[PDB]
Design a binder for this molecule. Structure first.
Ligand SMILES: C[As](C)(=O)[O-]
Ligand SMILES: [Cl-]
Length: 96
């Protein structure tokens, strides 16, 4: 119904919570592929004066983003993928 604006959650990617190879970005890409959706599109947001990074991910016309800032583009993108999965109640590829 409504796919406008941005959906947010307070999330930060913790690599220790995930198996050696799988990441939230990979889980989200696979979910899109299984659902026959366009692959996720990531756009970086920066606060250069603080060396901070955020990412807004678009999946099925909806924007998702963490409320929190990260130390790199890569880390911000994993956070954005977590928001996308978690807000939808989807499995995130965690250990437990
Ligand atoms: C994917 As970008 C060009 O917003 O870092
Ligand atoms: Cl999970």
């Amino acid at each position: 119904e409504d796919t406008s604006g941005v959906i947010k959650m307070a999330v930060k990617f913790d690599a220790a919570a995930y198996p050696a190879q799988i990441t939230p970005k990979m889980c989200l890409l696979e979910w899109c592929r299984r659902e026959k959706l366009a692959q996720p599109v990531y756009e970086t947001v920066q606060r250069p004066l603080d060396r901070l990074f955020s990412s807004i991910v678009t999946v099925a016309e909806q924007k998702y983003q963490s409320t929190l800032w990260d130390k790199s583009k890569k880390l911000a993108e994993q956070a954005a993928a977590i928001v996308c999965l978690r807000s939808q109640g989807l499995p995130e590829g965690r250990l437990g």
